[model samples]
Target: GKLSEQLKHCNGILKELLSKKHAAYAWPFYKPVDASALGLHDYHDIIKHPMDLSTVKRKMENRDYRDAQEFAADVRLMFSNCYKYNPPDHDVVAMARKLQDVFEFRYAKMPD
Candidate 1:
């Protein structure tokens, strides 16, 4: 539900907030490029993959198709790391003990 909610919001942001210039240079911009203006749209041998890692480069060159399947997984992972997991910033076990001490008014806080 959180992933679905976040994606719905992200789609709203992209469709309503992104400008044409922002779409071209933005890191997570998903808009398709205007290739015909660059004259590559008419060419069959346009150099699309100068730095790809895929063995099936030709088929996987469709960015939308490649990314569509991964979007849900990425969103799922992001929310999981953000909320469910013990964040790496703190010693979570120690923090929990300290929280207990604070709640019960004891000075038995564990080492961080």
Candidate 2:
């Protein structure tokens, strides 16, 4: 059910071919993707979108986290910025603050 609805929502948003080539499940929940479906082949073009959390979905598939929290924090913070303000009136300081908050929170509790 989750996968089906997610696929529908994603397809609606991107209007692209939702193949493994364009969409790779990392494990519990991550689906790092490119700006355009045709652009997915390039690793550099891939990014963890705002909706992707550091869940087992993507990492389980990949067998690794690979900066999962870091990517999640960045993407979430960015989207939160745009969501709070008009796109044309975006606040850079607020965005930077959000990123800082997430980074500090994530890094503070690292295992010794």
Candidate 3:
């Protein structure tokens, strides 16, 4: 099982993580962070790689990833950026924790 085979599970995982239930955290992450619009003037300087669920879905649909592993990386990459940018007191951190746990468990359970 490669991209075509593996990505079915990947898509299923993505669907669950992107839905509204995950929106408490997933809402802010649905798209790239607008540094200028939201302030955090130094956001771009610190977050070298920004990602979002929306972009991942679009990329997945465009067949942009070489494999599901790449898709997994992109999803994780989004969280990494989220963690780095958010303060420890931020609610996004806790909410991200829940969604991240879900994505990780499901992604890991998918057999190659």
Candidate 4:
């Protein structure tokens, strides 16, 4: 139950990151030029894209986390995939780590 709650929080933050307008620019091969320069009328190709989270959600929900390490691994894996797509940024990475650490601390029962 605790892990479930933590995941809800983590998922919430991730959703926030995905919703930010700047996230639209996270795709690869980005080039800033006039519409005519690219033979395009609007920048819909660049700006209009959905953040696909179905897979990520499934991965998070379907895992069998037996211990703290497994849970941590799942957390890292899920967030890493997000970071891979959201472009490299210190703030985003830091925010993600901070949120993850909270769950790790709450759930990760490291041995003494």
Best by lDDT: 3
Where does model 3 exceed 4 Å of error? 1-3
Which has the higher TM-score value, candidate number 3 or candidate number 4? 3
lDDT (Cα, 0-100) at 28 in candidate 4: 20
lDDT of 2 at 32: 35
Model 2 — which ten-residue stretch has the worst lDDT? 10-19
Model 1, runs deviating above 4 Å = 1-3, 16-31, 41-69, 72-112
In terms of TM-score, how similar is model 1 to the real structure? 0.23
For residues 9-48, what per-residue lDDT tens digits would candidate 3 score against the true structure? 8988989988877777678877888899988899989998
TM-scores, one per candidate = 0.23, 0.26, 0.90, 0.33
lDDT of 4 by residue, 34-106 (tens): 3477475644454443222344445456654434444456556545644554456656465556545654554
Give the clashing residue pairs of candidate 1, or none. none
Quote the lDDT for 30 in model 3.
Answer: 78
**Comparing 1 and 3 on TM-score, the stronger one:** 3
RMSD of each: 18.5, 13.4, 2.1, 10.3
Q: Per-residue error at 5 for model 4, in Å?
A: 17
lDDT of 2 at 83: 48
Deviating ranges (above 4 Å) for candidate 4: 1-63, 90-94, 104-111
